[PDB]
Amino acid sequence: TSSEQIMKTGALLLQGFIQDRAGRPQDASTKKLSESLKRIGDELDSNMELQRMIAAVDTDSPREVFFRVAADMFSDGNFNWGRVVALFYFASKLVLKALSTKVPELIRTIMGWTLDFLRERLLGWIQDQGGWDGLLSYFGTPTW
Amino acid sequence: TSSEQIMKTGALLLQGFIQDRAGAPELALDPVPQDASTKKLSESLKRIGDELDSNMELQRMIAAVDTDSPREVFFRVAADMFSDGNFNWGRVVALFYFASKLVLKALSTKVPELIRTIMGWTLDFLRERLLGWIQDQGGWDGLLSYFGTPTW
Ligand SMILES: [Cl-]
Numbered sequence: 001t002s003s004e005q006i007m008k009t010g011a012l013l014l015q016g017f018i019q020d021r022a023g024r025p026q027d028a029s030t031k032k033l034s035e036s037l038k039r040i041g042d043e044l045d046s047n048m049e050l051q052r053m054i055a056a057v058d059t060d061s062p063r064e065v066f067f068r069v070a071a072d073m074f075s076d077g078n079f080n081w082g083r084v085v086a087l088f089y090f091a092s093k094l095v096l097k098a099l100s101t102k103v104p105e106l107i108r109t110i111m112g113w114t115l116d117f118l119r120e121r122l123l124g125w126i127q128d129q130g131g132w133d134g135l136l137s138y139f140g141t142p143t144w
Numbered sequence: 145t146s147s148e149q150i151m152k153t154g155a156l157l158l159q160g161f162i163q164d165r166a167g168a169p170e171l172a173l174d175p176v177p178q179d180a181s182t183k184k185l186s187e188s189l190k191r192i193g194d195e196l197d198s199n200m201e202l203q204r205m206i207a208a209v210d211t212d213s214p215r216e217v218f219f220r221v222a223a224d225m226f227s228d229g230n231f232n233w234g235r236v237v238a239l240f241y242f243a244s245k246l247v248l249k250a251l252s253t254k255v256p257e258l259i260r261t262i263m264g265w266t267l268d269f270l271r272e273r274l275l276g277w278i279q280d281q282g283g284w285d286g287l288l289s290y291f292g293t294p295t296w
C-alpha cells in the first residue's frame with residue numbers, strides 16, 4: 001500500500017541502517033531492501049561531494065543543522081534514490097558523531113566523580129597500605 | 145610510591161576497568177600502561193570485581209532505575225558505601241564497580257534516546273519532503289534497481 005506502508009518500511013530500513021553503521025521482522029522483501037540500502041550507503045562513503053558536503057558542517061549541533069542540510073540536498077526539486085539514501089547516510093553520520101563524542105564524555109564525567117571521591121576520601125587510607133599494591137594483599141569481600 | 149603515583153595509577157586502573165566492562169571507545173586519555181606492574185593490579189581488580197557480581201549488598205547499594213541524573217545519585221551512594229568510616233580494598237574496588245555499572249546504565253538510555261530523536265527528524269523530512277515521490281515510484285522496491293551516484 002503506497003500510502004502508509006512506506007513509513008513503516010522507512011522506519012525499519014533506517015534503524016537497520018543506523019544499527020549497521022554503529023557496528024564498525026526483517027522478512028524476505030525487507031531483507032532484500034536492506035541489502036541494497038547497505039550497498040548504496042557503502043558506495044556513499046566514497047562520494048566526495050557527499051563527503052565534502054557533510055564536512056562543511058559542524059556536527060553535534062541542533063536540529064537546525066540537520067533540517068538545513070537535508071534541505072540543500074533537495075534544493076533543486078529533483079529526486080532520486082541515491083539522494084534519498086544520502087539522507088539516511090547523513091542521519092547515520094550524525095548518530096555516529098554523537099556517539100563518538102557524547103559517549104566518551106559520559107565516561108569521562110563519571111570517571112571524574114569516582115576519582116574525585118577517591119582523592120577526597122580514600123587517598124589517605126591507600127597511602128597507609130603501601131599504595132595500590134595492598135590490592136594484591138586482598139582476598140576478602142566487603143559486607144557493610 | 146604515594147601522593148601522585150596513587151592518582152595516575154588510580155585513573156589508569158579505573159579507565160581499563162570500565163573499558164573492560166563495556167561493549168573500546170576512544171576516551172582520548174593516556175593509554176593504559178602495558179607493563180608488569182599495572183597488568184598485575186588490573187588482573188587483581190578483575191578478580192575482586194568478578195566476585196562483586198554476586199555481592200547483593202552492593203547490588204542493593206547500587207540499585208536504582210533512572211530515579212535521577214546519575215550525579216547526586218553517585219555521591220549519595222558512594223558516601224553511603226563509606227558512611228561507617230571503615231575502609232578496605234573491597235569497598236575501593238566496589239567504588240570502581242559502581243562507576244562502571246552507572247556508565248552502563250546511562251548508556252543504555254542516553255544512546256537509544258539519541259538514535260530515536262535523530263530518526264524522528266529523518267522520518268519527519270521523509271514524510272514532509274520525499275513521501276510523494278516514493279509513492280510515484282510505487283514504493284521502496286525501486287531502490288533494488290538503483291545503481292547511480294547522486295550529484296547535487
Ligand atoms: Cl555494484
Ligand SMILES: [Pr+3]
Nearest residue numbers: 116117119120
Ligand atoms: Pr571535589
Ligand SMILES: [Pr+3]
Nearest residue numbers: 268269271272
Ligand atoms: Pr514536521
